[PDB]
Write a protein that binds this ligand. Structure first.
Ligand SMILES: Cc1cc(/C=C/C#N)cc(C)c1Nc1ccnc(Nc2ccc(C#N)cc2)n1
Lengths: 533, 412
DNA sequence: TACCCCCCCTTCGGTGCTTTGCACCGAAGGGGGGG
């Protein structure tokens, strides 16, 4: 007869299907250990019930076939608690809860599905097995049900179960911590569990999931720095992965140029020759990685702030803290979102990422401190077609500040030269004619080579900008160029758009107007006839 | 006890297992307190680790209040149970509610709190409350009473609703009563005082049967499709004619009768944009004819209940938005504008959220089918901030247009 | 050699308009910390 102070969680099976049909140091003592399990109430003998078959430590039985037979359970935990979101603890003890895995009773009706009759004798589990898919979820829900009264009476105690242990953290001293450990031992033993631990008890810092957890600080495991003279693609991939992992506590890590080297080669053996910029960034990263830096834990009695800095070539860094120079977390954003974009959109995406990660980790929103003037943000967002919102924030003077390099005009400029542009091309022969025509009479058309209608039009505006004054009006016929230039890009994936942007930088006033072509309005017909042949 | 109507999904389709977005700490404390209060009343019961189903849950507010409300995203359970609450147990929709004078919206949510749910169907309506930093496993629950936000609850409860509201319908044949989720629309042709008196009478009639209730009216008369009008100018330069030709070329799809033959003869040469060009008599006649076309209702645009509604939204600056409800594009079933409520530049996600709540309510009033929104916003930004300013018991379906629209042809 | 959980970077296929290119997105490889 078994005992069960806790209720048993009912377990079903997938409908329409039934259950399917060693160690080294313990291969003859399995009989003795099975008799011990039977004696201590864990196992009860059975008879001719169902035809089944199953395959210092103890024998473990595989439930690989039965795992796909038991119903689906709930993934109790999915994420990992980042150390920054934790709390400072003056005492963190660990208790051994390894033997409690077999102390959770199984369902009354499900015991008949877990039979290990291979010696033939009769033997079936009456408690939670090991390796069963449903066993961990049931065990860790029973643990929560057991520990609910203890946490309800002691709110400051924090309990975490990583594998075969229970880490209990409190803000009291060790002398008062022993009393609480004894109280928890009695409370958990009223259900029949003892937790004696000697090995890792009071041994900080814990090396958990790659972090050293000191009582009042946290850090990452020391990053190994490869120093081979020649690097294969795999070495560069490992280096960028290690740098990405290390950037969470080390500010200033840049990986853009290093990661750029992986393009063009797909095999895993070639040794790509290095470049000066990549070596410079590697040396810069190694400069920070020499001295280890650690963060502090979150304080619920103070607000948190998040700074943003720019590193050039489309990458930003951020530090989230609660007290100046006492950081909670650091990070970097360098993702390219779209072929053509400016730095204000990158700032918006960055602050989006910090807001989302602070919601995930802290459940709040931090006050931002951005290197941008309020007037620039207003002038950009009130005119931009998209929708966006930045939470409560402030401006801090820190170069290089973000700003719009050039702005376009809404009304035509008086007394300004007016250029008409167009571009013709053939999809087959890759031929191109992209020239401009002016009202004053200046007509300039140049042959093209290896261009497409969109590229021909973009470089038609490029030609219009090449020979003009400070005040210019330009008339086009393609919505592609209008969209690109109205988006006000500061970077692109092509050199032509970069040259166009550089031309826009110099001009004092620029006007762009689009009118439909192939309709006989304005000089579009004239320029189309000129560029047709 | 009362009979529980058997509820079953369509065979070959599993239940809801989607995850939940992270929640703010206050929106978690309020959610936990509300769930505990409902647990003490037997509305929800804790579920063990044997239930693999989950639905998202959020915490919202209401205007002129300080207490939170719990909202459950049932957009997948509704799509799975579509047959139960559309074909077998649908709700009729009057065809003359948009022709009424004043429509008042009331809340009937607690009516679903007094009816038990099917025993076999109790496991699909399970939700989870997460925790900060994923530290301690979230608290799970399932619904015992009929669920709020599930579109099948009106289908089940209409049998009792008919018996509740039959005397009120008999005494007042001059008003129309429609039900959509916890929303009750009463449409009347009376005046403000008469409407408020009838609202109070309906409220006390509901209180007679025990319905827990602790500028609500709409004005469908002012809901008219915005007509497109060209802007008259004292001086007409080349650029103005160019813009007019572009706008007319765009609008020729909407109105096939628009012609730009004479308006093109004034730009044969290569003239500077600033220089002024006078208007000929033929061009003036063609422009007048185009305006005459513009001042007529659309032709060939017929509503179709079989298809699905799609709602375009465009930001026009200065806090102005323009919306277009249609089932087939360039064929507008409805077109309208919207402006803010307060401030110089207070918020933009709030404006888009309450605009969505306005047009979706208008579409429910007019046709009853929820339009599929196409929001000009980033997915991450919307999903982060779609809830802080959202005040409604139900959620529509939207997609995102990461595509730059260049049409400024709705706002003057 | 499985099979998962979160992150970053590059790549590619599909998709939609800006229309046979080009932009945008989400799913796949590789990397990082682990079960
Ligand atoms: C996630 C977590 C992981 C471990 C990891 C166990 C292992 N290996 C140990 C504990 C006790 C916890 N739980 C919590 C809960 C709230 N605050 C904290 N902060 C906190 C973290 C580490 C130390 C230390 N030393 C002190 C306080 N920990």
């Amino acid at each position: 007869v078994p005992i069960s102070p806790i209720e048993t969680v009912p377990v079903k099976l997938k409908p329409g299907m039934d259950g399917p049909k060693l160690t080294e140091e313990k291969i003859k003592a399995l009989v003795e250990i099975c008799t011990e399990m039977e004696k201590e109430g864990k196992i009860s003998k059975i008879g001719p019930e169902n035809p089944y078959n199953t395959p210092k430590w103890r024998k473990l039985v595989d439930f690989r076939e039965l795992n796909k037979r038991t119903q689906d359970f709930w993934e109790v935990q999915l994420g990992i608690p980042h150390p920054a979101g934790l709390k400072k603890k003056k005492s963190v003890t660990v208790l051994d809860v390894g033997d409690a895995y077999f102390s959770v009773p199984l369902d009354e009706d499900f015991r008949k599905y877990t039979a290990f009759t291979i010696p033939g004798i009769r033997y079936q589990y009456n408690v939670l097995p090991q390796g069963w898919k449903g066993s961990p979820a049931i065990f860790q829900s029973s643990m929560t049900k057991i520990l609910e009264p203890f946490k309800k009476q002691n709110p400051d105690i924090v309990i975490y179960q990583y594998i075969d242990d229970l880490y209990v953290g409190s803000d009291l001293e060790i002398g008062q911590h022993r009393t609480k450990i004894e109280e928890l031992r009695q409370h958990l033993l009223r259900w029949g569990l003892t937790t004696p631990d000697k090995k890792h008890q009071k041994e900080p810092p814990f090396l958990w999931m790659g972090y050293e957890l000191h009582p009042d600080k946290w850090t990452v495991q020391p990053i190994v720095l490869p120093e081979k003279d020649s690097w294969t693609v795999n070495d560069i991939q490992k280096l960028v992965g290690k740098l990405n992992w290390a950037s969470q506590i080390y500010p200033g890590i840049k990986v853009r140029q290093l990661s750029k080297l992986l393009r063009g080669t797909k095999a895993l053996t070639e040794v790509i020759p290095l470049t000066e910029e990549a070596e410079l960034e590697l040396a810069e990263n190694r400069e920070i990685l020499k001295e280890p830096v650690h963060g502090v834990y979150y304080d619920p009695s103070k607000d948190l702030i998040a700074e943003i800095q720019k590193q050039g070539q489309g990458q930003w860094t951020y530090q989230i803290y609660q007290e100046p120079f006492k950081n909670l977390k650091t990070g970097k954003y360098a993702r390219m979102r779209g072929a053509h974009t400016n730095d204000v959109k990158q700032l918006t995406e960055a602050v989006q990422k910090i807001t989302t990660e602070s919601i995930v980790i802290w459940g709040k929103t931090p006050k931002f401190k951005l290197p941008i003037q309020k007037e620039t943000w207003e002038t950009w967002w009130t005119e931009y077609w998209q929708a966006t919102w930045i939470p409560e924030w402030e401006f801090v003077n820190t170069p290089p500040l973000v700003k719009l390099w050039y702005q376009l005009e809404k009304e035509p400029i008086v007394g300004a030269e007016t250029f008409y542009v167009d571009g013709a091309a053939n999809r087959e022969t890759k031929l191109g004619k992209a020239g401009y025509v002016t009202n004053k009479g200046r007509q300039k058309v140049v042959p093209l080579t290896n261009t497409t209608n969109q590229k021909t039009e973009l470089q038609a505006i490029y030609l219009a900008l090449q020979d003009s004054g400070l005040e210019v009006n330009i008339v086009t016929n393609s919505q592609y160029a209008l969209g690109i230039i109205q988006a006000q890009p500061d970077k692109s994936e092509s050199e032509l758009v970069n040259q166009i942007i550089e031309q826009l930088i110099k001009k004092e006033k620029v006007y762009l107007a689009w009118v439909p072509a192939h309709k006989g309005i304005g000089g579009n017909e004239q320029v189309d006839k000129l560029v047709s042949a | 006890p009362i009979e529980t109507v058997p509820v079953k999904l369509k065979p070959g389709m599993d239940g809801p297992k989607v995850k939940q977005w992270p929640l703010t700490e206050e929106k978690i404390k309020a959610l936990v307190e509300i769930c505990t209060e409902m647990e003490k009343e037997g509305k929800i019961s804790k579920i063990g680790p044997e239930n693999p189903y989950n639905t998202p849950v959020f915490a919202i507010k209401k205007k002129d209040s300080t207490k939170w409300r719990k909202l459950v995203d049932f957009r997948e359970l509704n799509k799975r149970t579509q047959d139960f609450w559309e074909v077998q147990l649908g709700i009729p929709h009057p065809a003359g509610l948009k022709k009424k004078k004043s429509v008042t919206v009331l809340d009937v949510g607690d009516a679903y709190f007094s009816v038990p749910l099917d025993e076999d169907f109790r496991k699909y309506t399970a939700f989870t409350i997460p925790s900060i930093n994923n530290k301690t496993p979230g608290i799970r629950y399932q619904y015992n009473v009929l669920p709020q936000g599930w579109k099948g609850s009106p289908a089940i409860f209409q049998s009792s609703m008919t018996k509740i509201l039959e005397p009120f319908k008999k005494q007042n044949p001059d008003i129309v009563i429609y039900q959509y989720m916890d929303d009750l629309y009463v449409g009347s042709d009376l005046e403000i005082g008469q409407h408020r008196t009838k609202i109070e009478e309906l409220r006390q009639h509901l209180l007679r049967w025990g319905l827990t209730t602790p500028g609500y009216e709409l004005h469908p008369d002012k809901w008219t499709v915005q007509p497109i009008v060209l802007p008259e100018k004292d001086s007409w330069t080349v650029n103005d004619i160019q813009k007019l030709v572009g706008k007319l070329n765009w609008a020729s799809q909407i109105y096939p009768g628009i012609k730009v033959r004479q308006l093109s003869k004034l730009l044969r040469g290569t003239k500077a944009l600033t220089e002024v060009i006078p208007l000929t008599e033929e061009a003036e006649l063609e422009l007048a004819e185009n305006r005459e076309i513009l001042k007529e209702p659309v032709h060939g645009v017929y509503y179709d209940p079989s298809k699905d509604l799609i709602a375009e939204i465009q930001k026009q600056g200065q806090g102005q938005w323009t919306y277009q409800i249609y089932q087939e594009p360039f064929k507008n079933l409805k077109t309208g504008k919207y402006a803010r409520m307060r401030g110089a530049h207070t918020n933009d996600v709030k404006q888009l959220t309450e605009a969505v709540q306005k047009i979706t309510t208008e579409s429910i009033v007019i046709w009853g089918k929820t339009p599929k929104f196409k929001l000009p916003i980033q997915k991450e930004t919307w999903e982060t901030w779609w809830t802080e300013y959202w005040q409604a018991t139900w959620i529509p379906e939207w997609e995102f247009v990461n595509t730059p629209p260049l049409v400024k042809l709705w706002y003057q």
